Design a protein around this ligand. Sequence first.
Ligand SMILES: CC[C@@H]1C(=O)N(C)c2cnc(-c3ccc[nH]3)nc2N1C1CCCC1
Length: 284
Amino acid sequence: RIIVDPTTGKRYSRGKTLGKGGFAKCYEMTDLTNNKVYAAKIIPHSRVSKPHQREKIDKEIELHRILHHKHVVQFYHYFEDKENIYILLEYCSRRSMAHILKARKVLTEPEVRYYLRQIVSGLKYLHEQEILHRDLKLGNFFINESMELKVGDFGLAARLEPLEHRRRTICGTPNYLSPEVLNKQGHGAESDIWALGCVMYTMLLGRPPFETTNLKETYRSIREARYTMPSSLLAPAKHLIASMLSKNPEDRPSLDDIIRHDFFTQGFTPDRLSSSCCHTVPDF
Ligand SMILES: CC[C@@H]1C(=O)N(C)c2cnc(-c3ccc[nH]3)nc2N1C1CCCC1
């Protein structure tokens, strides 16, 4: 099916569906004037009839469209017609880390380093733009044909705010509540670091350190920041976790500290991961 941008003339061809993405039905979409394929979110205006949800996509678009980095999903273009909003994004043929971890249960340490370095690279870029991601999770780490990771889905993302004027209410329903957010202190860069600690734990163990139901009954455990540290973890992995999930956000490492931790520096990390790793545990 041909889709024409009524503002420009520009023609696109819609391919196969890629699945549901919240407000969006997602599809392959080819720009006919370079012949490049994008992963597109197609959102009917009906799904955004309320002013707040209209503001929600507008914000996502506004923030995403200015980002350009190798480990951030590349925003291509957006337009609207009478029926839909179209957001064309970098096509990532190997799905997400959520799909990979579902298949693998647990990843090897060199793989954890491989993926984490790339997450840190993209997050660094974001934090220097003073943009907070606010929903870092495995499902938002998109993987391309060449096994390269891109951080995406900027649907809870916001610009950084000083504590004195900051939003103190929970924004959306993220995968990993910090202590500070649960203490009504709002979400800072350190809250993304939380969230990375939770990610690393999950990559190595296959389950999160705290419940992810976001039920009020879970709040005390998180805000204590007391959890099980399984013995199966190697010492450096344990130590790095342990710092990222510091109770006081001020005690958590910087992004530069994180990639220079013994967990990264004292182990093998290979330059390129094979696609078999979506599948099968790699060779020693
Ligand atoms: C468009 C939303 C999300 C996404 O944000 N990107 C960048 C993406 C890239 N490639 C793909 C992709 C290429 C081949 C299959 N999916 N998918 C992406 N998704 C999916 C679509 C359905 C749920 C999340």
